[PDB]
Scaffold this motif. Structure first.
Motif: not given
Lengths: 216, 262
Positions: A31, A33, A35, A37, A47, A50, A92, A94-99, A101-102, B43, B46, B96, B143-146, B150
């Motif tokens: 995608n 984008y 980030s 940490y 952070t 990003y 993200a 499938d959604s910007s609100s579904n993060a 992490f590695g 996660w 949000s 987001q 889709y952008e997230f960061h 914190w």
């Protein structure tokens, strides 16, 4: 769910450079984008990156992010002791609100000077002793690399029970700290001639001893 | 910009864990992240300014997030908790956004000026004239997230065990045990459950020369930790009082630590 694959751990030398990869699919890392940490134990996540390449405010120039297809890379140059930490990528999906992490990467910085442990051994307090219990506390600090082995002794012989020793953890000065506890009865404390906390680090041992009858 | 998590440090299995975040210096979307001991950042979900919520798919059925702009606070609820939910919970501000794009050297048919508006093409002329080298694709979504800011995080332990407030004992070296120029004092924070405890010295006025060690876990299930303070031999007239707070039991203890008179 989904997994962004990182190497479990990486290492680089002081003042040099190191890279950490973050492999996913086209539906997350693809995608464009990503980030990054930084996690130092006993501290909140911070952070770093990003949007693949953009450094967050306050982040030094030596942290740089990049991406080639479905694999992102965090690059750290001019390594310092305080960079030893856990690093997590994220993206993200499938959604910007579904993060997602590695799996996380632990970074070691090689070439730092060896530092022996400073050892402080405390006797049980009078207060504790009045309740028929006695805890000896061996505090271990300022050692690098961050690994020690602790041996307790009574009158020169190894104590084989009721010892608990913490893991080593990193200090504000990038050296390590740890502690060891010997749990006794008040009777045990008074009976033995002496107790010792022996701390071995890189083949060298530092011993502190306390004598009950002379502790006052 | 500061985020402050609040809630219980201890909850029982099968219970509902309810947390609150307090925002200051702003009004932006807020998310919840956790890290269980030994595990990666995870996660949770949000809620943005518009009040729309998004969740980790694998956990969604157990999660609920709401907000109250008046009180400037965001709530998190985790149902039917188990030991797997023991973790540090972070309130965060998150970016987001969802930008429609074309994947490669593909450009929106919109930008070509003809074919009106549909999806994506590799080259305006080629796909306009229908040349063999033309390639078409649907519009894709990026889709952008960061996480921006914190919170320090709230430690939550899931356990059926009752709380145990710590017993705080003074630490002082044996007599004769090395009058180095510097003296070491401390407090043993003994036999408590659960984590965490907060240790300050002299009501937090003393920070320099303080060393607080991570806790040891006894096989009895009770934690113990120690905090020590170094004192130069030149120092005189100073008192050292460790202040030990244990949120789970709502206890605060002040122990004055004296060197042995010998």
């Amino acid at each position: 769910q989904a997994v962004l694959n990182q190497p479990s751990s990486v290492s680089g030398s002081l003042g040099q450079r190191v890279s950490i990869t973050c492999s996913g699919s086209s539906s997350n890392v693809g995608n464009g984008y990503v980030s990054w940490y930084q996690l130092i134990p006993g501290s909140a996540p911070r952070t770093l990156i990003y949007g693949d390449t953009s450094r967050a405010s306050g982040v030094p120039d030596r942290f740089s992010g990049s991406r080639s297809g479905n694999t992102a890379t965090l690059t750290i140059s001019s390594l310092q002791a305080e960079d030893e930490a856990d690093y997590f990528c994220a993206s993200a999906e499938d959604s910007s609100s579904n993060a997602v992490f590695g799996s996380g990467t632990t970074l070691t910085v090689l070439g730092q000077p060896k530092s022996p442990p400073s050892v402080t051994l405390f006797p049980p307090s009078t207060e504790e002793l009045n309740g028929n219990k006695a805890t000896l506390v061996c505090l271990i600090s300022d050692f690098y690399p961050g690994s020690v082995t602790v041996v307790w002794k009574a009158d020169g012989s190894t104590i084989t029970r009721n010892v608990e020793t913490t893991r080593a953890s990193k200090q504000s000065n990038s050296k390590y700290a740890a502690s060891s506890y010997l749990s006794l009865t008040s009777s045990d404390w008074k009976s033995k001639g002496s107790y010792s906390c022996e701390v071995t680090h890189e083949g060298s041992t530092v011993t502190k001893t306390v004598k009950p009858s002379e502790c006052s | 910009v500061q985020l402050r998590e609040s809630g219980p440090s201890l909850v029982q299995p099968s219970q509902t864990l309810s947390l609150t975040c307090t925002a200051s210096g702003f009004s932006k979307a807020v998310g919840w992240v956790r890290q269980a001991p030994g595990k990666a950042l995870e996660w949770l979900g949000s809620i943005d300014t518009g009040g729309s919520t998004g969740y980790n798919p694998g956990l969604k059925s157990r999660l609920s997030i709401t907000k109250d702009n008046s009180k400037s606070q965001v709530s998190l609820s985790v149902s039917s908790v188990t030991t797997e939910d023991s973790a540090t919970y972070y309130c965060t501000t998150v970016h987001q956004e969802t930008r429609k794009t074309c994947s490669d050297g593909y450009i929106a048919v919109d930008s070509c000026g003809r074919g009106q508006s549909d999806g994506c093409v590799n080259d305006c002329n080629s796909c306009y004239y229908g040349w063999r080298n033309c390639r078409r694709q649907p519009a894709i979504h990026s889709y952008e997230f960061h996480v921006d800011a914190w919170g320090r995080g709230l430690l939550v332990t899931v356990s059926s065990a009752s709380t145990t407030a710590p017993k705080v004992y003074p630490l002082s070296s044996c007599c004769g045990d090395k009058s180095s120029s510097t003296v070491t004092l401390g407090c043993l924070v003994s036999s408590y459950m659960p984590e965490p405890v907060t240790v300050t010295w002299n009501s937090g006025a003393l920070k320099s020369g303080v060393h607080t060690f991570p806790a040891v876990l006894q096989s009895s299930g009770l934690y113990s930790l120690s905090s020590m303070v170094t004192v130069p031999g030149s120092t005189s007239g100073q008192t050292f009082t460790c202040n030990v707070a244990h949120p789970a039991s709502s206890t605060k203890v002040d122990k004055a630590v004296e060197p042995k008179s010998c």
